[PDB]
């Protein structure tokens, strides 16, 4: 199998955590898609990464699609329950954590894709506004306890900390870790891991 | 139960064909999110319809976690295979579709949430550019099929059909009944369902 990604992508890195837990063999291809020389389109038609490209040639997107395959390929370390409504718990924490995700490559776009006569303060600050809340969401949902959804580590934690940590990369302005300790403690936790020590974004 | 939703979303409608595909009772509440006095946040800390808030108050999100949450809720008309393999084939069309999706509302929001002054002509290229390509890709995979994955109705029609319709709804430009005659036939069968005829949008 082949993983067309970028070592920056949060996206990406949550598939790779993912692999990584899993014990699942790939190739890593790294692919800017932002170039116009960029190939991912022969895979992805919407030209994003990650996409997962297996041994038949049949391409698989997106990172939701991909994490929950991947975690069927192997019984080791599985992320997602079994149980629909607990299934339903971690795939609602994983979308929470993509669309911070979301609103925080908008608010990035808006620099590196706009000249400045081409942008909006209002766009900028409602993405930056959603930034907040599902932050102070996640603060609410972590609540006291030891995982996203208690006793386990799931999905829902890796798709968290890999939000937490690209804004800590790409957004060291939104002073989350002042606001609210329990994702501190979370953070700390999390970034110990393997995975996450493995797949940290350069520079 | 409630959905926050309104009825023009393809992504709600896509929950909405689910929940009617699975006779499902639930309370329809429209919610204008781009109102500056909409609610939505109470529910949603990205500030997006869908939303489904269930009877204890938990709050469900984005559209394909409710769409797969609403697959368990009933036997009825199943829609999201029991197989891995088979998941993935369905749960990469619904990405592929709303994929497409995220591009046209980009595109759409260009003009709707920015002055003239604030837009860029390559975002939209790009974004266009991806419908193109999903639409050349919807088309190559659903080949001379009787649905995206062979012989059952699955989730990755309800996700396309809504696709389609939207661009037929909001971009009568885009002329992808000229160029991809699967897709019409396609179209003009999940039309007459009953879930799509109850929930066309309306002007
Ligand atoms: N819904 C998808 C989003 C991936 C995405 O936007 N990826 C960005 C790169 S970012 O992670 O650095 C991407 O590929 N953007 C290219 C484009 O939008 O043209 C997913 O969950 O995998
Ligand atoms: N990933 C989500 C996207 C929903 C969305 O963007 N919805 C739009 C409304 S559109 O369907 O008319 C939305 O709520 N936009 C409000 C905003 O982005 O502030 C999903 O699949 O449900
Ligand atoms: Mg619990
Ligand atoms: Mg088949």
Redesign the pocket.
């Given at each position: 199998m082949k993983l067309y990604a970028?070592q920056?992508?949060?996206?990406?890195r949550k598939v790779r955590v993912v692999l990584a837990e899993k014990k699942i063999d790939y190739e890593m291809i790294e692919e800017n898609?932002?170039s116009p020389d960029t190939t991912?389109g022969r895979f992805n038609p919407?030209?994003?990464?990650?996409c997962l490209v297996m041994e038949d040639g049949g391409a698989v997107?997106?990172?939701?699609v991909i994490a929950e395959y991947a975690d069927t390929l192997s019984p080791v370390s599985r992320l997602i329950p079994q149980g629909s409504r607990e299934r339903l718990e971690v795939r609602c924490w994983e979308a929470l954590a993509?669309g911070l995700?979301?609103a925080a490559?908008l608010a990035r776009l808006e620099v590196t894709q706009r000249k400045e006569s081409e942008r909006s303060e209002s766009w900028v600050q409602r993405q930056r506004s959603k930034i907040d809340a599902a932050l102070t969401a996640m603060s609410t949902g972590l609540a006291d306890k030891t995982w996203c959804t208690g006793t386990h580590y799931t999905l829902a934690d890796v798709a968290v900390g890999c939000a937490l940590a690209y804004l800590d990369f790409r957004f060291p302005d939104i002073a989350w870790r002042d606001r609210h300790p329990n994702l501190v403690a979370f953070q700390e936790k999390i970034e110990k891991r393997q995975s996450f020590i493995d797949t940290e974004p350069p520079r």
């Open positions: 970028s920056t992508s949060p996206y990406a898609v932002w991912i919407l030209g994003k990464v990650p997107f997106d990172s939701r993509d995700l979301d490559l």
